[model samples]
Target: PQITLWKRPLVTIKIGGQLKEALLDTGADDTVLEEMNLPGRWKPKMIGGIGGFIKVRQYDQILIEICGHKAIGTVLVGPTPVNVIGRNLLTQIGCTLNF
Candidate 1:
């Protein structure tokens, strides 16, 4: 299956048994969630982008499903404007640029 890249490339994804809409961001290296209650120990991390930087909780070994493609990896939870699915999970779902 091929995924068309939208302006935002948003998709519905399941995380921790919950469904949420996330943006497929090729510019990001790690997946980031707006905010969530995840079960496990998470390390505090600070990530920077176009906007300054933000402190986030980095949880490892998280299960995620996007467009039927399931993958387990690290997920960052913080005060993000939107949920983002970065390269960490995008590659697992076989996403590509179609512009």
Candidate 2:
């Protein structure tokens, strides 16, 4: 199997006034903001995660293309092992997260 930051198409989102590509991951439960592309204004805030009080900040929603579909959603900026596409996206697209 091919594993990457994203197995499918990545969504283009604007953060800190710049646009970057982010992976939409159904496997991830929460938004996983990539530290590399984190916007300047997007500060890290505390949020309950797999471990505990991890920093999580909100970002403005932007348009991005994924799987040949267009979607608009916000991104979570925080500390995570990997970049992720969260539940909000899954529900919007009507995809069941099954293992």
Candidate 3:
């Protein structure tokens, strides 16, 4: 339950049908990913940041696995800078900022 801050705070994540890498972004409020081919029903939503709002296609059917713990959570699919696992899943996976 411990991690250090570094470049992107990278971690192995399982999505779609493959194991891949993404950032466990504590600063972000929700999960967001670069646009890849994942078929699901989605709703239009917006995510706010200092840079302003970014519209995303919100998919509630995304089953994500980070390290070993897994959860079905909302995944915002759009042109994000990188794949990010945010507080939505981060907290559910029992993460803490203990140093």
Candidate 4:
């Protein structure tokens, strides 16, 4: 038997029929999603990331699930090896972290 006191949740976001899994990271400065997964309609609005801005289109309200808990809200899109949860999702869910 294994006892786990800490149960970190992984968040999942879906857009344009595409699904991407990510871990909720309050430490992240901003929302981050894989640019490769973005659909053609979103290709135009490309924006920036850690280094600087890039051509990326931010996505709108989408499904998010974490440790059996879930909610929907606007998420940011950027060039990510994988999605990174940011203030957009956290603020939407009423979850805040101290800096």
- Which candidate achieves the best lDDT against the true structure? 1
Error of 4 at 76 (Å): 3.4
Best by TM-score: 1
- Candidate 2 regions exceeding 4 Å error are 1-29, 38-44, 97-99
Residue-pair clashes, model 3: 0
What TM-score does each of the candidates earn? 0.90, 0.56, 0.89, 0.54
lDDT of 2 at 51: 75
Cα misplacement distance, residue 38 of candidate 4 (Å): 6.5
- Candidate 1 per-residue C-alpha lDDT over 1-99 given as tens digits, one digit per residue, 9 for 90 to 100: 655644656788998889999988898999999988888899999998789999999999999998678989999999988998999888887777765
- Candidate 2 contains a number of clashing pairs equal to 2
Ranking by TM-score: 1, 3, 2, 4
RMSD of each: 1.5, 5.3, 1.4, 5.2
Question: Please, what are the lDDT tens digits per residue for candidate 4 over residues 39-89?
Answer: 333324644555676655655655665333465755566566567777666
Model 3 alpha-carbon drift over 4 Å, by segment: none
lDDT digits (tens) for residues 26-97 of candidate 2 = 656656665655433554466566677777776656444444445566667767765666776656556553
Error of 1 at 76 (Å): 0.4
